[PDB]
Amino acid sequence: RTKPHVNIGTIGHVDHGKTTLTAAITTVLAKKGGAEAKAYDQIDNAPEEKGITINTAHVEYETENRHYAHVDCPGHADYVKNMITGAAQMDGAILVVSAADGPMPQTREHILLARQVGVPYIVVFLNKCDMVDDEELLELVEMEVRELLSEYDFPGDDIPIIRGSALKALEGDAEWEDKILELMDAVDSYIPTPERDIDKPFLMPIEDVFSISGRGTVVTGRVERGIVKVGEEVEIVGIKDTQKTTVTGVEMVGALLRGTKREDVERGQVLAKPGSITPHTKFEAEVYVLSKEEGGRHTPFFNGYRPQFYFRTTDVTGVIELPEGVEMVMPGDNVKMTVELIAPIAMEEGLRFAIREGGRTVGAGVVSKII
Numbered sequence: 028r029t030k031p032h033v034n035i036g037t038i039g040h041v042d043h044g045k046t047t048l049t050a051a052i053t054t055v056l057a058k059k060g061g062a063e064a065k066a067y068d069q070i071d072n073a074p075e076e077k078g079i080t081i082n083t084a085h086v087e088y089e090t091e092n093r094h095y096a097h098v099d100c101p102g103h104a105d106y107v108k109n110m111i112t113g114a115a116q117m118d119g120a121i122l123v124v125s126a127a128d129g130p131m132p133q134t135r136e137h138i139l140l141a142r143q144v145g146v147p148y149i150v151v152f153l154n155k156c157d158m159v160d161d162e163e164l165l166e167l168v169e170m171e172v173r174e175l176l177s178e179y180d181f182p183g184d185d186i187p188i189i190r191g192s193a194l195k196a197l198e199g200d201a202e203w204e205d206k207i208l209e210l211m212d213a214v215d216s217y218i219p220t221p222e223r224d225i226d227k228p229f230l231m232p233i234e235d236v237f238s239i240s241g242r243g244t245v246v247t248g249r250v251e252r253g254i255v256k257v258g259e260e261v262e263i264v265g266i267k268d269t270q271k272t273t274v275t276g277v278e279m280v281g282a283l284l285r286g287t288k289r290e291d292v293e294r295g296q297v298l299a300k301p302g303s304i305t306p307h308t309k310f311e312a313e314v315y316v317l318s319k320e321e322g323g324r325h326t327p328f329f330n331g332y333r334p335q336f337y338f339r340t341t342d343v344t345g346v347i348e349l350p351e352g353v354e355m356v357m358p359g360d361n362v363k364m365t366v367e368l369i370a371p372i373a374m375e376e377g378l379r380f381a382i383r384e385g386g387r388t389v390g391a392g393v394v395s396k397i398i
């Protein structure tokens with residue numbers, strides 16, 4: 028009964044048909060009993076998720092094979108923040124491109140950002156083909172998309188591209204609805220089933236550290252991923268030198284560490300399966316800077332800026348370095364930056380983090396490269 032799960036969403040330039048396509052998928056699959064149909068205005072007027080406000084619409088649907096959690100956002104800003112903060116992280120993305128307009132810079136930005144934040148697969152719905160009649164023009168637009176995808180390491184020659192009309196399929200023209208079913212067919216067969224968080228190496232951020240007579244040292248947290256059992260040896264990674272310990276028991280999630288004293292463990296470091304995650308100070312990251320109206324910051328970022336980077340449980344100060352030719356980053360903009368932290372942190376590609384000054388959040392980011 029329960030089907031494999033896949034997180035997806037519609038990326039692309041504004042007004043190329045992201046929200047219409049989302050409505051068309053649910054409306055068409057409702058005819059196969061695979062979804063509850065959602066209207067265009069439900070998805071367009073998206074709810075708010077959150078220390079950063081993001082407008083994200085959530086629809087659900089099923090093919091006969093899989094269950095999809097689908098994410099759609101109103102504006103470009105929401106897509107930058109959703110893909111960075113990982114509010115609803117995706118194992119694949121449906122790239123919507125207008126056949127009349129062709130690829131635009133937000134198409135470029137969403138592909139670059141999708142590659143940098145860890146979106147592993149891409150399917151292309153070439154939309155609004157009811158407005159175009161020249162087939163040579165469609166062939167060229169498709170070539171531009173494939174080359175644009177290859178420019179950012181996606182397999183442009185292998186990625187499925189379906190020409191369709193989200194609107195005409197929404198209004199119920201059966202021949203256009205078939206291109207929706209071919210999109211989902213392409214999604215079922217091209218986007219692989221994600222690995223389970225519990226198949227991955229074990230990882231638990233440390234929040235508190237107690238010492239109760241009769242239980243030694245207790246460490247509390249939330250298992251990010253993986254699984255830990257009784258008597259397993261785990262490493263403590265981040266901030267200090269890495270050290271080993273055995274898990275006496277899990278009490279619920281308080282982990283009793285067999286032979287670690289209380290001052291040898293602190294908030295900020297993580298429990299991990301030995302040799303699975305390592306400490307680092309230097310990394311590159313895709314960062315979004317909060318705009319003025321978001322309570323972020325009314326002055327720009329700059330090279331040498333030294334804010335705190337909140338990784339999982341604690342703040343860690345670090346110095347900022349912006350791309351070549353960039354000196355200031357305005358509020359509301361995003362950028363890729365190099366960061367050198369004061370102290371090492373258990374770090375991996377895809378780790379989210381907030382950027383704060385004192386108490387306030389001025390940015391958000393994803394680790395995209397380790398150094």
Ligand SMILES: Nc1nc2c(ncn2[C@@H]2O[C@H](COP(=O)(O)OP(=O)(O)O)[C@@H](O)[C@H]2O)c(=O)[nH]1
Nearest residue numbers: 040041042043044045046047154155192193194
């Ligand atoms: N003719 C045509 N119009 C479309 C199609 N898809 C979307 N539109 C129109 O494009 C406009 C904006 O589309 P929208 O779904 O808001 O794109 P989004 O901003 O990327 O989510 C709307 O007024 C739609 O009616 C299509 O396949 N064909």
Ligand SMILES: [Mg+2]
Nearest residue numbers: 045046071101
């Ligand atoms: Mg829309």
